[PDB]
From a paper:
We report the cryo-EM structures of β1-adrenergic receptor (β1-AR) in complex with Gs (GαsGβ1Gγ2) and a partial agonist or a very weak partial agonist, and compare them to the β1-AR–Gs structure in complex with a full agonist. We determine the cryo-EM structures of β1-AR and heterotrimeric Gs (GαsGβ1Gγ2) in complex with a partial agonist (dobutamine), or a very weak partial agonist (cyanopindolol; also called an antagonist). Overall, the structures of the β1-AR–Gs complex in the presence of isoproterenol, dobutamine, or cyanopindolol are similar. Therefore, β1-ARs in the three different complexes, with Gs-proteins, adopt similar active state conformations, even though they are bound with ligands with different efficacies.
We have solved a 2.6 Å cryo-EM structure of dobutamine-bound β1-AR and Gs complex, and a 2.5 Å cryo-EM structure of β1-AR–Gs in complex with cyanopindolol. While some of the interacting residues are common to all three ligands, including Trp1173.28, Thr1183.29, Asp1213.32, Val1223.33, Val1253.36, Phe201ECL2, Ser2115.42, Ser2155.46, Phe3066.51, Asn3106.55, Asn3297.39, and Tyr3337.43 (the superscript denotes the Ballestero-Weinstein numbering system), dobutamine and cyanopindolol each make a unique set of additional interactions in the orthosteric ligand-binding pocket. Dobutamine is additionally coordinated by the backbone carbonyl oxygen of Gly982.61, and side chains of Leu1012.64, Val1022.65, Phe3076.52, Val3267.36, and Trp3307.40. While Trp117Ala mutation decreased the potency and efficacy of all three different ligands, Leu101Ala, Val326Ala, and Trp330Ala mutations only decreased the potency and efficacy of dobutamine. Compared with the isoproterenol–β1-AR–Gs, the dobutamine-β1-AR-Gs structure showed different flexibilities in the ligand-binding pocket, TM1, ICL1, TM2, ICL2, TM4, ECL3, TM7 and H8 of β1-AR, as well as local regions of Gαs and Gβγ. Dobutamine generated a slower signal activation phase and an even slower signal termination phase. For example, Gln2375.68Ala and Thr2916.36Ala had a larger effect on dobutamine-induced cAMP signaling than on isoproterenol initiated responses. The cyanopindolol–β1-AR–Gs complex is the least stable, displaying the shortest half-life. The dobutamine–β1-AR–Gs complex displays an intermediate stability. When bound with dobutamine, β1-AR transitioned to the inactive state with a TM3-TM6 distance of ~8.3 Å in one of the three GaMD simulations.
Author numbering:
A (entry chain R): 44 to 242, 247 to 248, 284 to 357
B (entry chain G): 8 to 64
C (entry chain N): -1 to 128
D (entry chain A): 15 to 47, 191 to 238, 247 to 288, 293 to 307, 317 to 350, 353 to 380
E (entry chain B): 3 to 340
C-alpha cells in the first residue's frame, strides 16, 4: 500500500507540474482555453501535494496523527480541491460546447476577462462549500459515535450529517456530471454531422476520444459519491475500507487529466523541450 | 521589333562603358569600413546596461 | 555574373505523324531542386501548360491532349530537359518554351503561363505540315 | 510628461479594446478567379468583408500571401471555358493554391459557374481530359460533365489536405451564394474546433 | 537587317561579360580569411510590443531611434514609444491590406500603402492635435510594395507593376517614373545620399537608379528566384539581396559583380527581410521558418539566431543609432532585441 500511494503521489505531481510549466513557458500555448487547463492543473496539483500525503499517512498508520485542527483543515482542503477539479472539467466542457454550437458569437461571448471571472467564481464556490461549513462545525452529525469521532484527536473519519453530504456531493460531482454529459452529447452529435458531410473510422475516433474523457471521469469518481450519498442513510451497509478505496480511486483521477487534456501536438512538443 | 532591339542595345551600352575596379578593391573597401566603425556598433559590440534604452535608465 | 537561362533546341519541320525530340538546356540554377514544365503558344493563342516533371523525376503530369504521345524526361547529370513527341498532329505547330517553377523545394508552381514570367526560355519552333 | 504618456496610452487602449472586439466579430474572404474592391455584407448579424483583388497584373505569387488568415478563399471557375484550355489553367491554379505553404490551412469554397453554358456546349471535352470517356457518375450528359470537373478539383483537393482544410464545391444568385458562404464558414470554424479536440 | 542589332547586342554582352570576368582578382572569402570571427551573437528579447490584432507586414523606425511605426493588416498604423512600450498613436487606415509603411526623417509624417495602389501620407503634428490624412499619391497600377521619404515633400515608391516612382507631395505629382524591371518590384532602398536607389524584383535581378536622371545605371543578376528584400550597405558602395532560393547575396556597385552568398544546406526557406547593423559586418535576415539568422557578412558564416516568433518573420529594422533590432512577424507581435 505504501508504494502504491507513493507512485500515485509521484504521478499526480509530475503530470500537473509538467502541464503548468509547459503552458507558462510557451507562447504558442497561452490561449484562452489553457487558462481553464491551468485552473484544472492547479487543483490537481494541490490535491497531489497536500491532500494525498495525509490520506496516505492515514491509511498506512490507521490513525490520524496531527491533532483535530489539521484534521478539519485537511478535510476542508480535500473537499475544496476536488470540487475545483470537477467544476473546472465542467467549465472546459462548457467552453467546448460554446465554441462548437455558437462558432460565430464565440469570439465575443468568451474573452480573457470573462474567462478569469469564471475561474474565480469556480474557486469561490469551492471555498464557500468547503472551508465555511467544515470550520464553523456546520458539517458535524449528532450520532454518539460521530461524537466520539469529533471528540477524539486521533480520529479523522468523514462522518457527516445528511445535509452537508447531500449538498456537497451535489455541488462537487452531480451537477458537473450532468452538465458534462449534456454538453458532450451535443458535441458528439455535431461531430457526427460534420463527418457525414465530409465523407466510420472517423466516427470511431470521435467516440474513442469522448469515451476516454467521460469514462475515465466517471469510473474514477462515481463510486465514491454514490457511497457518500448512501453513508448518511445507512451507516452499516458499506464497509469502511471500501469507502476509503473509492475515495482513493477519485484522487487517482487527478493523475489522468494531464493525459486526457494535454496531448495536443504543441503540448507534446513543449513537454519534450522541457524534460 | 526593331524598337525593342534599339532599347535592348542602348541600355546594354549605357552600362558597358563604366569604370569597373577589381573585386579585391571592393572587398578591401568593405573590410576597411566594417573595421572602421566597429566600436560604434552596439549589437556587434555588447555594451553595459547603464547606456541601453531597453534594459535600464 | 551568372543568370537564369533556358535554351530550347531540337525544333524544326516535321511531317504529320512524324517525331521530334526537344532538348532544353538549363543554366544558372541547381536543376534538381526545381520542378520543370513545358508550355507552348500557337498562332494567335495564349500560353498553355503542356507538361510537368518533378525534382526527382517520378511525379509526372500531362495536359490531356498530349497523353500517350509526349514524354517528358529529366537528366540531372547533364542538366537537360527532354520532350519526346511522336504521332505528331498539325495542331501541335507552335513555339515551345521550357519553364521553371519560381521557388525551389515547393509543390506549388505559380505563374508559369503569365506572358511575362521571367524564368522561361525563348522557345523553339515546331511546324507540322506538308 | 510620463503622466501624459500614460493618459494617452489608456485612451488608445480603450479604443484598441473596442477595435479588437470589432475585429473578431467580422470574417474576411478572398474572392479569386481600384487596387482592391471591398464588399461588406451581413448575414444573421454576422459581418463579412469580401475582397476582390482585380487591380493587379496576373502574377499572384506575392500578393496572394496577404490572405493567409482569411476564413476562406472563394475560388470561382467557369466550367464552360484561338481557344485556350482554360479549365486546365483553373486546375493548375487551384493546385498551386492548395499546396502553397501559406494557404495550406485555408479552406477553398469552389464555385463552378456557367453550368448552363456548359450544358449548351455539350450538345469538345473528350479531347482534353481523355479520361472523360471512362468516367462514371458517382440529361445525364450535362451532369456527368459537371461532376467530372468537380471530381477533378476534388482529386487535387483530397490528396494533400491532412484534415486541416477542405473544399466546399457548389454549382452556381447573390442570395444563395451569400447563404452558402455563410454556411461554409460556419462549417470551417466548427471543423477547426472539432479537430482541435481530436474529434476529427 | 535586324541582325545588325542582334550582333550589336551579342558583341556588347560579350564585352560586358569579359570586362566583368577580367576585374575579378580574388574572392571576398579570401581577403576576408585572416579577420576575426564575430564571436557567436546571442541577443535576447528586450521588449514585446503587443496590441496589433493581425500579422505585421511592415515597420520602420524613425530617425530618433525611439519611436517606431508598424503596419498591421488588421488595418492599423501604430506609432509606439519603444522605451516605455507606450502607444503614441494608433491610426485607423482606410484600407486594411497595407504592405509597407514609412516614417519621415523629420518626424511629422508617416506613409503607408498596399493592395490599394495608393501611398497615403498622414500628418502627425497639427493644430487640432489629431493625426489626419495629408495626401494621397495615386498613379501606380499595382500594389505598393515599399515607400521611402526623401524629405517632407518628396517620396519614392515601388510597385507590383514593375515600376518605381518619385513623387512631389505638395502637388501630388509623379515627377519621375523608373522602368526596366520585368517582375514585381518587392523592395527598394535609398542610399545614404538619397541620390541613388536600388530595387529588387521578381525577375531575380536588382537595378540601380539615379533619382534625378530617371535612368537605370546597372543591373545585377545571379539569384535564382524572386528577390524579396534589398538593403543598402552602410556606405552605399554595395548592397545585399535576399531571395526565395534560400540565399542572401552581396553585390558591389563598383565591381558590378556578386561578391558573396550566404546559405546553408539546412536552410530551405526563403528570405523575407534583411538589414545591416550600424557598421555593416552583421547581416540580419528574417526567414519563413519563423527565425532570423545573423550572418557574418564578411565571413559568410551564420553568426547567430533570433528564435522568438511563432510565425513568419515579416519585417526587420535596425535603429539609426544601432541600439536595438525590431522584428515583426505573422504572430502579430513586435520584438525588440539587443
Ligand atoms: C477528506 C476526506 C478524507 C477521506 C479519506 C479517508 C481515508 C483515506 O485514507 C484518505 C481519505 N475525503 C473527502 C472527500 C470529499 C470531497 C468532496 C465531497 O463533497 C465530499 O463529501 C468528500
Amino acid at each position: 500500500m505504501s508504494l502504491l500511494m507513493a507512485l500515485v503521489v509521484l504521478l499526480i505531481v509530475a503530470g500537473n507540474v509538467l502541464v503548468i510549466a509547459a503552458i507558462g513557458s510557451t507562447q504558442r500555448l497561452q490561449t484562452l482555453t489553457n487558462l481553464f487547463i491551468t485552473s484544472l492543473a492547479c487543483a490537481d496539483l494541490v490535491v497531489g501535494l497536500l491532500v494525498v500525503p495525509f490520506g496516505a499517512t492515514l491509511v498506512v498508520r490507521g490513525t490520524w496523527l496531527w491533532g483535530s485542527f489539521l484534521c478539519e483543515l485537511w478535510t476542508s482542503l480535500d473537499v475544496l480541491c476536488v470540487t475545483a477539479s470537477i467544476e473546472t472539467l465542467c467549465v472546459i466542457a462548457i467552453d467546448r460546447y460554446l465554441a462548437i454550437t455558437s462558432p460565430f458569437r464565440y469570439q465575443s461571448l468568451m474573452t480573457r476577462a470573462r474567462a478569469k471571472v469564471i475561474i474565480c467564481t469556480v474557486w469561490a464556490i469551492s471555498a464557500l462549500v468547503s472551508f465555511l461549513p467544515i470550520m464553523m462545525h456546520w458539517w458535524r452529525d449528532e450520532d454518539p459515535q460521530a461524537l466520539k469521532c469529533y471528540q477524539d484527536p486521533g480520529c479523522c473519519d468523514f462522518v457527516t450529517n445528511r445535509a452537508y453530504a447531500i449538498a456537497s456531493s451535489i455541488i462537487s460531482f452531480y451537477i458537473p456530471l450532468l452538465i458534462m454529459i449534456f454538453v458532450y452529447l451535443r458535441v458528439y452529435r455535431e461531430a457526427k454531422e460534420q463527418i457525414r458531410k465530409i465523407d466510420r473510422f472517423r466516427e470511431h475516433k470521435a467516440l474513442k476520444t469522448l469515451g476516454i474523457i467521460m469514462g475515465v471521469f466517471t469510473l474514477c469518481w462515481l463510486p465514491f459519491f454514490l457511497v457518500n450519498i448512501v453513508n448518511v442513510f445507512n451507516r452499516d451497509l458499506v464497509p469502511d475500507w471500501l469507502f476509503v478505496f473509492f475515495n482513493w480511486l477519485g484522487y487517482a483521477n487527478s493523475a489522468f487529466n494531464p493525459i486526457i487534456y494535454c496531448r495536443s501536438p504543441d503540448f507534446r512538443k513543449a513537454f519534450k523541450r522541457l524534460l | 521589333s526593331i524598337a525593342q532591339a534599339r532599347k535592348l542595345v542602348e541600355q546594354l551600352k549605357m552600362e558597358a562603358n563604366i569604370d569597373r575596379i577589381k573585386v579585391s578593391k571592393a572587398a578591401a573597401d568593405l573590410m576597411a569600413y566594417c573595421e572602421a566603425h566597429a566600436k560604434e556598433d552596439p549589437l556587434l559590440t555588447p555594451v553595459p546596461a547603464s547606456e541601453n534604452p531597453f534594459r535600464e535608465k | 555574373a551568372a543568370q537564369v537561362q533556358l535554351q530550347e533546341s531540337g525544333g524544326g519541320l516535321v511531317q504529320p505523324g512524324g517525331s521530334l525530340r526537344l532538348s532544353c538546356a538549363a543554366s544558372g540554377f541547381t536543376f534538381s531542386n526545381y520542378k520543370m514544365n513545358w508550355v507552348r503558344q500557337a498562332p494567335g493563342k495564349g500560353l498553355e501548360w503542356v507538361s510537368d516533371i518533378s525534382q526527382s523525376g517520378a511525379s509526372i503530369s500531362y495536359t490531356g491532349s498530349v497523353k500517350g504521345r509526349f514524354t517528358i524526361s529529366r537528366d540531372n547529370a547533364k542538366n537537360t530537359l527532354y520532350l519526346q513527341m511522336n504521332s505528331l498532329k498539325p495542331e501541335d505547330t507552335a513555339v515551345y518554351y521550357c519553364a521553371r517553377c519560381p521557388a525551389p523545394f515547393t509543390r506549388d508552381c505559380f505563374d508559369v503561363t503569365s506572358t511575362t514570367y521571367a524564368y522561361r526560355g525563348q522557345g523553339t519552333q515546331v511546324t507540322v505540315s506538308s | 510628461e510620463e503622466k501624459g504618456q500614460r493618459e494617452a496610452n489608456k485612451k488608445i487602449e480603450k479604443q484598441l479594446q473596442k477595435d479588437k472586439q470589432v475585429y473578431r466579430a467580422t470574417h474576411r474572404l478572398l474572392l479569386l478567379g481600384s487596387g482592391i474592391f471591398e464588399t461588406k455584407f451581413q448575414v444573421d448579424k454576422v459581418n463579412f468583408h469580401m475582397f476582390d483583388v482585380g487591380g493587379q497584373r496576373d502574377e499572384r505569387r506575392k500578393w496572394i500571401q496577404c490572405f493567409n488568415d482569411v476564413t476562406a478563399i472563394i475560388f470561382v471557375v467557369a466550367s464552360s471555358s484561338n481557344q485556350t484550355n482554360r479549365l486546365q489553367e483553373a486546375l493548375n491554379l487551384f493546385k498551386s493554391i492548395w499546396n502553397n505553404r501559406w494557404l495550406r490551412t485555408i479552406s477553398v469554397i469552389l464555385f463552378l459557374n456557367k453550368q448552363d453554358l456548359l450544358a449548351e456546349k455539350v450538345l469538345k471535352i473528350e479531347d482534353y481530359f481523355p479520361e472523360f470517356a471512362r468516367y462514371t457518375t458517382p440529361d445525364p450528359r450535362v451532369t456527368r460533365a459537371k461532376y467530372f470537373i468537380r471530381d477533378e478539383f476534388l482529386r487535387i483537393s483530397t490528396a494533400s489536405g491532412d484534415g486541416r482544410h477542405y473544399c466546399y464545391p457548389h454549382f452556381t444568385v447573390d442570395t444563395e451564394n451569400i447563404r452558402r458562404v455563410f454556411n461554409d464558414c460556419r462549417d470551417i470554424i466548427q471543423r477547426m474546433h472539432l479537430r482541435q479536440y481530436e474529434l476529427l | 537587317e535586324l541582325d545588325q542589332l542582334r550582333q550589336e547586342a551579342e558583341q556588347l554582352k560579350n564585352q560586358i561579360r569579359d570586362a566583368r570576368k577580367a576585374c575579378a582578382d580574388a574572392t571576398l572569402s579570401q581577403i576576408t580569411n585572416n579577420i576575426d570571427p564575430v564571436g557567436r551573437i546571442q541577443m535576447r528579447t528586450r521588449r514585446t510590443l503587443r496590441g496589433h490584432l493581425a500579422k505585421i507586414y511592415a515597420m520602420h523606425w524613425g530617425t530618433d531611434s525611439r519611436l517606431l511605426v508598424s503596419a498591421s493588416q488588421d488595418g492599423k498604423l501604430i506609432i509606439w514609444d519603444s522605451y516605455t512600450t507606450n502607444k503614441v498613436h494608433a491610426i485607423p487606415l482606410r484600407s486594411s491590406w497595407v504592405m509597407t509603411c514609412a516614417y519621415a526623417p523629420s518626424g511629422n509624417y508617416v506613409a503607408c500603402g498596399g493592395l490599394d495602389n495608393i501611398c497615403s501620407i498622414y500628418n502627425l503634428k497639427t493644430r487640432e492635435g489629431n493625426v489626419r490624412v495629408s495626401r494621397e499619391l495615386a498613379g501606380h497600377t499595382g500594389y505598393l510594395s515599399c515607400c521611402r521619404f526623401l524629405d517632407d515633400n518628396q517620396i519614392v515608391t515601388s510597385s507590383g507593376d514593375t515600376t518605381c516612382a518619385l513623387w512631389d507631395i505638395e502637388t501630388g505629382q509623379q515627377t519621375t517614373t523608373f522602368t526596366g524591371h520585368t517582375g514585381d518590384v518587392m523592395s527598394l532602398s535609398l542610399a545614404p545620399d538619397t541620390r541613388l536607389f536600388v530595387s529588387g524584383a521578381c525577375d531575380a535581378s536588382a537595378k540601380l537608379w539615379d533619382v534625378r536622371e530617371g535612368m537605370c545605371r546597372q543591373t545585377f543578376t545571379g539569384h535564382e528566384s524572386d528577390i524579396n528584400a534589398i538593403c543598402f550597405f552602410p556606405n552605399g558602395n554595395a548592397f545585399a539581396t535576399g531571395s526565395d532560393d534560400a540565399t542572401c547575396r552581396l553585390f558591389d556597385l563598383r565591381a558590378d559583380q556578386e561578391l558573396m552568398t550566404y546559405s546553408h544546406d539546412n536552410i530551405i526557406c526563403g528570405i523575407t527581410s534583411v538589414s545591416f547593423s550600424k557598421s555593416g559586418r552583421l547581416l540580419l535576415a528574417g526567414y519563413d521558418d519563423f527565425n532570423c539568422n545573423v550572418w557574418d557578412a564578411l565571413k559568410a558564416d551564420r553568426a547567430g539566431v533570433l528564435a522568438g516568433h511563432d510565425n513568419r518573420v515579416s519585417c526587420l529594422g535596425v535603429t539609426d543609432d544601432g541600439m536595438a533590432v525590431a522584428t515583426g512577424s505573422w504572430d502579430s507581435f513586435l520584438k525588440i532585441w539587443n
